[model samples]
Target chain A: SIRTVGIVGAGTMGNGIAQACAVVGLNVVMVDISDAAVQKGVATVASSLDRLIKKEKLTEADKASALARIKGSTSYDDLKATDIVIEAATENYDLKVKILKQIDGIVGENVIIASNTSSISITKLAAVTSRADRFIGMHFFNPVPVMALVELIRGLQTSDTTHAAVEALSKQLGKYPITVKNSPGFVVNRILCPMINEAFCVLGEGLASPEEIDEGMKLGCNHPIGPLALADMIGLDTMLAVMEVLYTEFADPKYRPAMLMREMVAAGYLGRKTGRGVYVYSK
Target chain B: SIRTVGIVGAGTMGNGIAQACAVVGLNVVMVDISDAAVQKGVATVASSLDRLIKKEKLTEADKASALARIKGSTSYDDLKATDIVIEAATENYDLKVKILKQIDGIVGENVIIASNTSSISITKLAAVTSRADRFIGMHFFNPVPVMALVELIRGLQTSDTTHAAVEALSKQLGKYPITVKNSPGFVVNRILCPMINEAFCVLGEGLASPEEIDEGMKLGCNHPIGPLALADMIGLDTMLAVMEVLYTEFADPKYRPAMLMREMVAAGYLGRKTGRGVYVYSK
Candidate 1:
């Protein structure tokens, strides 16, 4: 069991990490650039945990212990004793390089650094930092508590030891971990992104109704969910980002983002969240 | 319950139909042009039903009733009171036309006539008899008992009454029915064959390995069976037949059978039945 897991940042994924770590009874040190961001992340984790307790999924004592084990930080000075640091910050290469350099200076030589990026090259990220052998990919799916999979990706220079360590940690975190190359979007996104992109192509071509296309997939082929519905759950902007990475990586016409997906994202009708996308949802 | 159903012909499909009907305690009139062929169909049905009894899925008494109900016949004069007649005869349109010509005069006007032709137009098949009003498409999947879905196709001229009767009978026979159009390949094959052709297109172009393409589809799209595996299961020859119909009807480049498929079928490496196709089956 992993204890003393350090997490950096506290936005959607940052809060997700805090919630996951705290619930599993690990001491998590959430490091952010400012005190306010840490506070917000802490509150998000607390609220999420509170929901669990209210639903009788977690006892009151467990919530308190989970809260007690989590601490927020504005700097990396205290990360020396941390076993692993998971970075879920914004997709900023320069900022990540700076953060990696700072964390490398503070943490012991053996402490592992992992990035939870969905698309950025893990090898490239490690190349700009000190300790390439220690950096790895920890690609947790969105809304971490619910998704069952975590993709453990290997960068070009990622060591076998680092890969095994990430796989071991992911298993302990109750995830169905699939280890693969640190390609754009890793395993699930690498494949799923292109499919939804093609569905967007079909939709853009007016080949079928979004509803009919979905039904065509679900009933016609027994897909768990329709592609468009899956796109909505994946978020419009995220779908576009995934498409851009996929199209750029594969250089295939099939991966190009749909005109409709772009227009929807531009309008902020980001599926499920805004209740408007390819399919409308009443809030 | 449909007590007595007439199964026309004694080929693989007809034999499988007789077996299914007999298993469900329905009296099956296993009809053929010759007594030997009908007897062979009856024997095939009995052996298959006996296997089910050994599996303990059906009681011995149930098997006895099924066996007792089956009547092998070389004459249509014996089918006057048959509840439904499923024609699983040869794909030759003239043979079906000749069969349908004699069928209308001897059988009751209300007796449901369903054809299992994969390529012929359902309305054209229906036009051979005066009871065109009672004709429907009862597209039972291969190996009848194993495949769950049965495509219930209603031709343009087929009455809603005919569709309802077939739908009612399909449920009684324990089948998952999806009502589809009388178009080429009905529903599943219409969509699936082209996609499988596209997969072959990928193969023909040297884009990836057969294993790689199958893995990509299985892992990426979450299809229950990979397209090539599905084509192999359906038999390469049968797939070619379906593709020909689709090409002739839709005149689409996508449905054109790949040269590889034509060559494979021409080599008699049909599929699992012949132990070879796109992929080999193990003993």
Candidate 2:
């Protein structure tokens, strides 16, 4: 029954989701706090579509139609007709709660409300809305058009109907969705971050150099990229944040961030974004 | 100067090592405790070469030449003429020590001694030999004909000359070598085993099903395979063993084997070998 999709926060995730929805022939109303933010999101979508056209994955006509299906706005009222509203706001808990509350008031009572949060509690976010049963977590990976995973998380109050609807919608968008419980770090990050942290610990202990460590995994285990190198691409700051969330939520020392990771973040070597991390970058 | 190679214990790893050495035109003296074992090793090598021939990776003449270079035997005295000796014996501390000591007495004083152990301490094994400076750990992956990685581990007393010699030898065998200080799990398993263990913890918590967990990682992280599925392929028993090594060596609770993994092994669901692990398989 879902058709129109509403996206809050016109940042990286929001814009990507908007394009994905639009490409699947669904109406997308992308909203931001300011007109300039909305414009930027649309511009990003246009450029991404242009890239697809260049790669022949999309045609000029297809790009135009897809872009035409996306409506960017600065007003919350624009989301009134949405069948589902996904809050892809910043990772701040308060900001997400406030946005969900505001979106809750704007969307129709039957509309499903979801969060693209990687760490926050979906149940708590749903508690702020009157339609807790309709509320779910639709966590999408970055570069939504390319990555095929949509981690469909079910909060405690989430209904089976809402879960099935979102799962089908995810498939319609050409993504492979997996359902997970409302837990800290959910499924992927819960398992991935600890491995990255351990790689940092190994590097810190001087067991092997960064290149050697990455090459060892690449050749030995058939991993496409080495952990430290992947960590650099993921940004050291973000890796630390996710590990901290795991450590705090579980209250387990096993999730403790590596001392080297903490110091590197403190030193402003946040990774490829900052031009340095466990390994130095040219840029 | 390294023209001849001595290989002890013609089991899977031993024959694989023998094939690799022979493929590079090096004379190989493959010694096993019994004649039947040596013949089995040679038969395995022949079938493996036949596979390569079928794939057109090797010509019939090439296979014949490679086979001619490998001399399988039951006595250690055949290894006396070799320039380097690699012990690919079963992974038992006392047994490996006994073999290393016996080989040390037979081989020339200048011949380098190496252990193809995945977990045992290279330093402790080196202490059992007369020339600790020439002792090293050269860990090769399974299906050695297909895998390209050789982890060159340097023991505490391993000399620069010995390390350099093995590094060059690995390249001659068409493998990429990474040097690491002798440590538990080296690099790949050090990082790999813990990740597999965390996947077990996530599955045990019922956060996600095995297929979903595997799919999430494959799509989310771009890993070639999911950790749980990879664990099954690695055999849960082997995974548990490596984890135990990491836990006991570091004495860190973080490396503790997941309770679920322990129980699964207790139930005899080893992995693909037993056709049941975190997932079931068809016979």
Candidate 3:
């Protein structure tokens, strides 16, 4: 049985998941394409740990150990003894395709690989790799440490061993996992995408003002966040990408991005990251 | 100056609206075509108030006042001094047209007669009365008091005074008044109908199980009620009515109810009311 884990990419999801694993007492090798990227990822992971410790959620010593356990590297050679690898690379299909091939080559045959993809078909992403049967989609919603939803998506070829091991690993990380069939958006995304897209369509048709739409969901229907606001929080660019994948796979207008969404994204107002979207953010 | 409002027909919606007016200190004359129907309407209103009193949401004294404020009758003679007469009789046009003519002949020029219709074209309904300018759509949702959405739909010949008075009255009743141009489904229905219809489409297609479909909406999108569960709550017959109105008005395949809905309603599996719908009730 393998112990050490490796995480690919150094973006929000990458660092977040890496911190999640390390905090759970697993030694993590955080790998990236460049030294600069790996350095920033480590800093981000450190900041995340510091925040947890400040909140008294994690002990200072535990935070220090967790930060110390994450060894940063820029090459696949560092993944030699890794038992599991979670790819959080960009949604770019070609890039993900290239990266999966390299991971399958360098990691040992027993090493199980997974994608932390939000919308891509896990089966398709797993196809480009050598151990297709051992690959699965372990989708964790944002704010990885807090949000309890984890969907362990099994692709068409995912083996029994793959399913059991992934479920065990998620349990080890103290996460609740819902098994969803390999479909566009899996369980959460599949249902959520349509409703969110419908909200956009409602907005696109000028059915109600954005304020009323948001308030309607918030008050009339009890929801933590409105769809448009959620899209902004998810990043309009990311929403558009996920929506496109869902639309193409389902060929349903329900999944198609609303005209306003495409236009807002085109204007570079991709939400909180860009300081504006359907509604503006101060910071 | 609409005082002593005349409520034509005492059905579920009509009686509820009548009680709402009575509770708010309006002397409402609730009329029905038959004596048995009038007795049932008065009983319904009393039971409705009794429930509220038992829940301690209303006092016994207030319930008595509400009951005393309402006049249950079978003749158009009860409508004479009423400044505004809202016809909540039936969905059929010929019946509503005949009532409008009688209400117009009985009430004053400034009586501002309206229809508590969910779907019939306000223009067509208004054209029947001599004073078309005094026509308005005081469209209230089911259970009147609980549902806060009140659509003030303007008919083709409805004057500004009619719109203002009805809109003000809706606000006076402690509801959110949305002034929407006379369109099918008006506002809330226009937005909610298509989405619910789409869920039915997904179910009809066997794309996902009903439990899964409902789970997606509840878990994924944070909706208070799942679409299928909501359809069940609405009763299959009622849902079928909404679909028919939307389909006939919009002429869009999107608004048409699935064959499953039609068959289910035809079989008298209305929903919670009939003890069977999307899912069978325990009894």
Candidate 4:
């Protein structure tokens, strides 16, 4: 039932979220820092739609209409008319707070402000905005158009009406939303990152080779992919950051990141994004 | 190729493993401590095959031949001629070692001895026998007639020939085998059980209700089932046991079992079997 969704940041995730909205017939306003980055993001969305059409999942007409629905902007003033604005900026606490504050000043008082933050505190982000009741977390997974889940996190001050609205809106965008409490790493990352870290330890301890470890999980556990390969895909740096947050919040040794993961991150082997991590990727 | 496969124990897993072997045209000798237990195991295999037929996964003719391939016994003495004997006994280290030692005493010199242990050490099992080179682990997932993976683990003294033979045999039984080294919990359990334990902790910490927690993992992370539901299916006792083994072996508190899991096991609410666990199952 939501219309005019605004997405900030012109990265893959921002564009992907925007495309998802556009595909669902909602008008999209995409905000980025510069014209060049926004242009690249728009191109990515067009190509992504083309691939979807080639796969017969989308019609050419749908792609054209979805593209037509989106508009790019370099100014926060452009988002004032948006009914809801989701900030899909970089995964930093301070940067996110700053962006949300700017958007709060521009957008209508009743506009729902959400963050695509995978792990930062929704309560903290909500506290920074005057419309705390309307602030929530709409944590979309990577490759937004493909992944089914959209974690709807409620900050301490988030009202029932706001949470309910976003949950319905997420379904409109063809995503399954599961309400998560505002906790460090929330549910998915809290369970997932530790498992990836343990995979690193398993490799470090010579318990099994990467192939064997991966195959064991895929075959033995009926997992879509092995943990090692997933770690590589998730990026070691991101995985480490999530673990650190979990460890610091819980003050438990169990959430500690694996030594090998830290070393891999330090070496700048950030997985497929870096052409290497636990596994090498072809450039 | 192993023409004869001896399966020790006639419980759910024991019968499941027997059915897997029988389906692959290997003669199965299912051994149990009592005639009553063995009869139930045979019945289980027949019913399982019937379900497969109902689902159109197997032909009626195939089910008949597969059922005909199995022969049940209360004595290990009947298993002397089997090329390989897989001990799918109760998950007790002492009992397993005793069963292995007994099998080693009666079976032929070159006969392969494998355990369907989910977490026990294959190395220790091999150390108790004179034919250590023949000892290995063929860890099958539950409902083995359906699941696609069979984790092939190598003991310290297991020969390459032994490992290679079982790996091929696993594939012959329509399973993908990933060779894991001799370690407590090996690959899958070492990673999986801990996450399940963490789920227990998450529940204990009141992070979310059981349904929300399960839905979070399922919808948020794209897992087939919520961790708690999986724990219930796998049996909370089994989850606790695997975690205990991991904790004791690693001597790390990180592998410590959650308090709720211990309480659940002690409460005799083992899961779907008892119709109670993280969520109560309808009787």
Candidate 5:
């Protein structure tokens, strides 16, 4: 029954969520801290939609209509009438806490709130809100329109009704929703980042060259991309951060970041973003 | 210039290697312990080729010619004339040692020897042979004709000549060869199995249901198959055994197998082969 969506922040994830909701015929109130940030978010969505149109997946009319559904603003007042508000701000604990508390006070009592956090504790985030039972994690992968998964993570206090509503809303956005209990890395990163870390371990051991390691997994296991290359694309800094979270949360040495990953991040060889990681990029 | 190939133990990997060799016009001598075993191996290859024909990937003539190139036998003497001999025996160190010693006694001094071991150490196996420098590991994936990767593993004493020859031979069989140092699980299983193990960990932790975990990964990571489902297909017993090797070889707790996997294997829910695993299968 959710119709209007309020999105906090106007960054990559925020705009992506806004676009996904808007395309599904849901009204989106995308709020940012400044006019420039809101404008940039809308521009990114416009370009993304235009790219879809170029690929013949959407028409000019569809793009215009989808854009029209998204109301970008630098004010929290716009979120007051939203049925559900999702905070997709930067993955900083303090920033998210402040935003969640602010949004909790602004939205209607019955409104459901979600976070697009990839690693933070949903239960902790929810505890900061007045309606802990209504707060959930609606983790959307990058390039939200292209990826089909929306990890519907339930906090410790997340209610069954809230879970059911968000699950339905995720499907309406054309995503495959998988309900997950709040845990470190949930399901995907809990399993994936470790594999990526192991690849770094293998690389550090001089067992195989990065190219060979990547090529072996790709051809051997039928994986679309190799681990090291994927880590590079994912940004080694972010990779380390997630692994550190798992390590700290689980307190398991097995989740420890690879020494190579640590060194690479320290050297500012963040990944494709920095033009260096396990492999070099032309940029 | 390698032309003739000898394959030991006509089981799944053995026949798969034989078929791959024959399709590329190499003469194949596939030997087993008994005539019945050899016959069954040949039949599997025939049906596999027939399946390819039905799929239009192979013509009737191609199937016939490929089958004609494979000569099934029950004696080690037939391998004497082969340019290279590959032992695809059961993953037992003592058994591989015996096979390597026997094959070394029969083949010419210059003939290269390889083992299709997925976990056993090539270095240790090479020690049982008089020509350790000529021995290597040529690990092929399951359903070899379709999978293109051939992990070329070099033992401590394995020579450059031996590695180069196998690398070239792998390409001739229409496979991509990735050179790896002698290590547990090489590249594929080392990176892949641990990911599968972590999936077991997540499932055991009650973070998500089995289907949700698998679906989340498949949809989220763009992996062709989910880790748990892939584990089901890859026999839990086999999965546990590889993890044991990785754990033992590295002496690292990080490579430790999940407790749930050990219990599942103990309960005999091995995997697809046993008709049950992380998920149920209809017998």
Candidate 6:
């Protein structure tokens, strides 16, 4: 039943959320700090829609209409009447809470606010807002439209009504919603980051070269891509940050960041974003 | 360069290795302890090739010729002339040692020895034989023809020449060879098992149900299958054994088998083979 959606931040995740929502005929108010940032987010969404048009998944008329449904904004004034606002800011907890607090100040009392925090406690993010009962985690993977999962996370005080509403909204966005208890890295990243960390350990131990390790899994296990190559795409810094969150949250040594991952992040070989990570990219 | 290959055991791995070799026109001496077992192995290979024929991947004549190359026997006497003997027996250290020692007693000194072990120590398997330098791990994934990886493992004393020969032979069999140093779980299982173990932990902790957890990975991460479903396909009992090997080798808690997996195995819900494990299978 939700119609108007507001997205904060205009990074990869924010743009993806806006694109996915806009494609499904939902009014999207994509907000960022500056007009240029907002325009950049809109441009990214348009380009993504163009891709869908190229693949014939979306007609030119559909793309034009989808683009028309998205409105880029630098002011919170545009999100006041939104049915839901999703914060896709940087993963740092304090930054997220500050942004949510600001959003909560401008949004209506009934507006449901969600955070796309992969590792932060949803309850903690919810607590910083006056509408804790309506605060939840609506985590979407990168390339939000293509990746079908939307992790619907419940805070300690998250209401059943909020959960049900987001579930319907996610389906409307063409994503499958899985209700998960808010935990470190929730489900996917928690299990996955450690595996990527282990691949780092494997590389550090001189077990095999990156190509061999990736090929072994790709051909042997029928995985779509090798773990090392995936690490590069995921950004080594992002992988390490999640591992740290897991390790710190549980005080478990098993979740310790791999030495090589730390070294790679330190070297600024963040991943495909930097053209260097577990493996180097030409561009 | 290995014109004649000997394969011990007629289980899934054994039959798969035989199929790959036979399809590549190698003279295969496939041995088992019983005539019935040997014939059953031949039948399995024939049906597998029949599937390839059905899929138009192979001709009826190709199937007949591939079948013609594989000679099944119940005696070790037939393997004295094999250029290389690959032991694809059950995944047990003692069972593999017994087979390898027996093969050593019967085969010529120049013949290479390989194991299709998923987790046992290749170095230890090598130590029990007189020709340690010739002993190696030629690990293949399940359903051989479909999986392209052939993990070429070098034991403590495995020679470069032996590694080169196996690599070439693997290529001849239409598989990619990735050289790995002898380590518990080698490359794939070492990285994969812990991720699966964590999935079990997520299930154990009531974070998400089996379906949701699997769906999260499948949809969120683009993994081909959910971890729990894969555990079912891999057999929960097999997964537990690999975890045990990793734990014993590394003495790390990360590789500890999840308590639920232990209970599942104890309850005799092994996996797809037993119709139940992490998830249930009708067959």
Q: Candidate 3: misplaced stretches above 4 Å?
A: A1-6, A18-29, A33-82, A164-180, A185-191, A194-208, A213-219, A223-283, B1-3, B43-58, B92-94, B200-209, B254-271, B274-280
Q: What's the lDDT for all of these models?
A: 0.75, 0.90, 0.79, 0.86, 0.90, 0.88
Cα lDDT of model 3 by residue, B184-279, tens digit: 776556656556666666677655567767765675555778888988887778878988988888786645577888888889988899789888
> Can you write out model 5's per-residue Cα lDDT over B23-120, one digit (the tens) per residue?
88999999999999999999999999899888779799998898888888898899986899998977877777787888989988899999887888
The true-versus-predicted C-alpha distance at residue B70 of model 5, in Å, is 3.0
What does candidate 6's lDDT look like per residue over B100-197, in tens digits? 99999998887899998777888988999999999999788877877877889999899999999998999999888888999988998889898899
Q: State candidate 2's DockQ.
A: 0.84
TM-score of chain B, per candidate? Answer: 0.90, 0.98, 0.92, 0.91, 0.95, 0.94
Model 6 CAPRI rating? high
Model 5 stretches with alpha carbons more than 4 Å out: none
**5 or 6: which has the higher lDDT?**
5
lDDT of 5 by residue, A1-283 (tens): 8989989989999888889888889999999888999999989999998888887897899888998899888889889868999998868899988989899988877899999889989999999999899999978999887899888899999999999999999989898898889999988898999999989988998999999999988887778899899999999999999999999998989888999999999999988998988889999
Q: Write the per-residue lDDT of candidate 2 for residues B1-283, one digit (tens) a residue.
A: 8899999988899988999999889999999888899999999999998998897787899889998899888888999879999999879888888999999999888889999988999998999899999999999999898789899999999999999999999999999898989999888888888999999999999888899999999989888899988998999999999999999998999898999999999999998999999889998
Candidate 2 scores an fnat of 0.86
TM-score of 2: 0.98
- lDDT for model 4 comes to 0.86
The alpha-carbon RMSD values of the candidates against the true structure, listed in the order shown, are 6.6, 1.3, 4.0, 3.1, 1.8, 1.9
lDDT by residue for model 4 (A1-283), tens: 5789998998989998999889889998999988999999999999998998898887989988888889898988889768899999878878888899998899888899999887788998899998999999878887788887788889999999999999888988887777877988777777877888889988988877898889877766667888889988878888898888899988988788898999999999999999998988899
Q: Which ranges of candidate 4 are over 4 A from the true structure?
A: A52-61, A64-68, B33-75, B263-269
| Poorest 10 consecutive residues by lDDT, candidate 1 chain B | B200-209
TM-score of model 1 (CA atoms): 0.66
Candidate 5 pairs with clashing backbones = none
Give per-residue lDDT, candidate 2, residue A96. Answer: 82
Given candidate 1, what's the lDDT at residue A58?
77
Candidate 1 error regions (>4 Å): A1-3, A18-26, A33-68, A91-111, A131-133, A193-232, A235-244, A256-271, A276-280, B1-6, B9-29, B32-148, B152-176, B179-283
TM-score, every prediction = 0.66, 0.98, 0.82, 0.89, 0.96, 0.95
Worst 10 residues of 2 chain A by lDDT: A51-60
Model 4 agreement with the true structure over B1-283: per-residue lDDT tens digits: 7899988888989888888888888999989989999999988888888887897787989888887888898878999868999888767778888888898999988999998877777888899998999999877887788788887888989999998899888888887787778888888888888888888887887766788778877765567888899999989988888888888998999998999999999999899999999889899
lDDT of 1 by residue, B142-232 (tens): 6776665577777766888778877777777776677766766665555556667656655665544576556556655567777788788
Please write out the lDDT profile of model 3 over residues A70-121, one tens digit for every residue.
8888878888858899898877788988888988999877789999877778
Q: What does candidate 2's lDDT look like per residue over A4-81, in tens digits?
A: 998998999999899989988999999987899899898898998888888778788988898888988888899986
User: In model 2 chain B, where is the ten-residue run with the lowest total lDDT?
Assistant: B55-64
